[PDB]
C-alpha cells in the first residue's frame, strides 16, 4: 500500500501517466489497509435516560439514570 | 427400639429429606409467582445484571 501510494504521488516527477492496472492494484491495497485499521464507534445513552426498575437501582446499583457521557 | 435420643434424630432427618425431595419444583414455582407479583424488582429477576 505504501509503495503504490508513493508511486502515484511520485510519477509526476518523470511525467508519466499511470496505467489502469496500477491504479486498480493501488486502490485495492489501500482498501485493504483501511480495512485493517477500521474502528466503528458505539453510541451511548444520553445521560438523562431512565434506568428501569428491573436493574434493581436500590441495592445492586445507585444509578437511577445512565452516566452515558464519559 | 431407638432407645437413645441420637438414634431418634437421624430418622427425623431422613424423614425430612424424604418429604422435601418430591415437593421441590412446585414450591419453587409458588415462590417465584409470589415474588413476581409483589417484589418491586422481581419481574426481571434472573437477568438483573445484563449488558
- How far away is chain A from the Cα of B35, in angstroms, using its nearest Cα? 13
Residues of chain B found within 8 Å of residue A49, distances taken between Cβ atoms: none
A55: contact with B, CB 8 A cutoff: yes
Count Cα atoms within 13 angstroms, Cβ side, for A37: 5
Q: Chain B residue with minimal CA distance to A59? A: B41
Pull the grid cell for residue A9. 504521488
d(CA B9, CA B16): 11
At residue B7, the 3 state secondary structure works out as helix
CA-wise closest residue to A26 among A38, A8, A12: A8
- How far away is chain B from the Cα of A56, in angstroms, using its nearest Cα? 6
CA-wise closest residue to B51 among A63, A30, A36: A63
B36, B39, B41, B44: best to mutate for the A interface, most A CBs within 10 A: B41
Pull the grid cell for residue A32. 485493504
Cited resolution, angstroms: 3.7
Residues of chain B found within 8 Å of residue A45, distances taken between Cβ atoms: none
**Is the distance from CB of A51 to CB of A65 less than 8 angstroms?**
yes
At residue A60, the 3 state secondary structure works out as coil
A14: contact with B, CB 8 A cutoff: no
Pull the grid cell for residue A34. 483501511
Q: What are phi and psi of A65, to 5 degrees?
A: -145, 155
Q: State which H helix or E strand residue A7 sits in.
A: helix A2-10
CA-wise closest residue to B34 among B21, B45, B23: B45
Amino acid at each position: 500500500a505504501v509503495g503504490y501510494q508513493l508511486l502515484l504521488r511520485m510519477l509526476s516527477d518523470y511525467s508519466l501517466e499511470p496505467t489502469p492496472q496500477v491504479l486498480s492494484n493501488a486502490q485495492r491495497s489501500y482498501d485493504a489497509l483501511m480495512t485493517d485499521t477500521l474502528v466503528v464507534p458505539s453510541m451511548r445513552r444520553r445521560g438523562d435516560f431512565p434506568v428501569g426498575q428491573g436493574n434493581k437501582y436500590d441495592v445492586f446499583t445507585s444509578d437511577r439514570y445512565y452516566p452515558g457521557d464519559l | 427400639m431407638a432407645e437413645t435420643l441420637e438414634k431418634k434424630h437421624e430418622r427425623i432427618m431422613l424423614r425430612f429429606d424424604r418429604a422435601y425431595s418430591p415437593q421441590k419444583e412446585v414450591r419453587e414455582k409458588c415462590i417465584e409467582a409470589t415474588r413476581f407479583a409483589r417484589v418491586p424488582g422481581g419481574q426481571w429477576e434472573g437477568a438483573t445484571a445484563a449488558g
